[PDB]
Amino acid sequence: GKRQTEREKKKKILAERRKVLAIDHLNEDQLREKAKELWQSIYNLEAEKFDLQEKFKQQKYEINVLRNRINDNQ
């Protein structure tokens, strides 16, 4: 399925499709605002990835239920 497309998509999200931006080129109050904004966005991303880890555990448990059901069903 053209894994080149998958690789380039991942790379673009890694560097281009993500909000990648040089910002430490500003005046004092504005630089403080921008640093706080990026840090808080990244903190929200921390909460998101924590929930991703939690739901990933849940999906792992669901797949365990899947295997147990399949083995018991055959």
């Binding site: 999200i13 890694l14 993500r18 990648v20 040089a22 910002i23 430490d24 630089l31 403080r32 921008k34 640093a35 990026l38 840090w39 966005s41 990244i42 991303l45 921390e46 998101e48 990835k49 991703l52």
Partner: peptide, 16 residues
């Protein structure tokens, strides 16, 4: 601020 920019990029890549 630039240190936090780099850290934001690192953990943003990780979380993505």
């Amino acid at each position: 601020c630039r240190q936090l920019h780099a850290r934001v990029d690192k953990v943003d890549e990780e979380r993505y």
